[PDB]
Amino acid sequence: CSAPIIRKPFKHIVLTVPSSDLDNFNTVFYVQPQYINQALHLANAFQGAIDPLNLNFNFEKALQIANGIPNSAIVKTLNQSVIQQTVEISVMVEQLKKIIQEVLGLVINSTSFWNSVEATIKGTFTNLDTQIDEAWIFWHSLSAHNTSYYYNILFSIQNEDTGAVMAVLPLAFEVSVDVEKQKVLFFTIKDSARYEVKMKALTLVQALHSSNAPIVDIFNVNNYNLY
């Protein structure tokens, strides 16, 4: 009979490990082991963009931090309302995925990567019930006729396509919906609602820096002295 089709093996690990410092980012890493340290450094550096009191992503400070990272360059930035209409969540995910592709600049060839991107985007609007009390989401302006929240995501990509640099993408959505939280919490890909979505993102590339440091040492790094 037909033998199973084989593909290059990749590990898919959802890691939840206690942090040495504050972390308000839903992190997605598509990199090689020796570059995990570099990715983690870049991730932590962008923590400072999240206002400690109001938990909003500050684009201005994000740029300040960006232009301070050594051996890097800001590819493309974005900061504006990307969705202002009644829409079915399914359709909205496609628009945002296309906008991310654009903002990312570098063209990555990976089904898994783009699936991670889409899955993450879907998670920004659905299955919120399973994400209640997580640091990457901050609710506010709650009402019986409205539900607002902040959602912070950070993509870190490095592979054959990126070449000599690693791409980092601090992404933050300011979402507002014309419904009550109890309904929003159980929203599915097929649901519709009047949405107001603002997006703040910037893609930064930094020269590849290999590191085979002791794994624990890597996770002991804090959000200080990085840029």
Add this chain to the structure above:
Amino acid sequence: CSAPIIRKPFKHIVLTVPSSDLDNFNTVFYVQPQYINQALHLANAFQGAIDPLNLNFNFEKALQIANGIPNSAIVKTLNQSVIQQTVEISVMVEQLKKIIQEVLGLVINSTSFWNSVEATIKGTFTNLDTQIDEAWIFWHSLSAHNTSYYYNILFSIQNEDTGAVMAVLPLAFEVSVDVEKQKVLFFTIKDSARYEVKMKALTLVQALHSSNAPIVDIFNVNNYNLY
């Protein structure tokens, strides 16, 4: 005004890194850095339970491997049909989550952990469209009136609650649905269908073993010489 409520910081990283050997498990790790190596070892050891040709999880070999891991003990095992009826996916996730809780034995106190568990379970039946061509899912018996598939998951938990041991949970679902794949691919938490779900799982605890090895060395480990 009211200051934001703060909680113990945890990193939530979805890691997709190229593997040194075959990996057909959707991995979820809730452990400390110094125990990641141990978790990774246990994970790889259970790869051998997946038949390389038919991609089915072999419970018998799983036990064989289990009783070979040094300094460990098999807490509870399971191997049987757990769902045989028309059900709404939402309701089904709850049953399975309760069955996992039971099979796990050790009582873990963590909202994040149980959210990871629920999210993972939901992903076993929904958003399959974003998981097409991934190693942890193997389709078969496809028809216009039926869709079957294998879904392999591996949980690795270690915290204050586990104490002196780490808990590993190789979980594999054999799913069969009375519908066609095109419909299944776009199923939501609110969808219903006649389901046949077989579950194969076992919880193994192993004495804690700390390791601060070079991160790359850790990911170079293959699926051989482990038990």
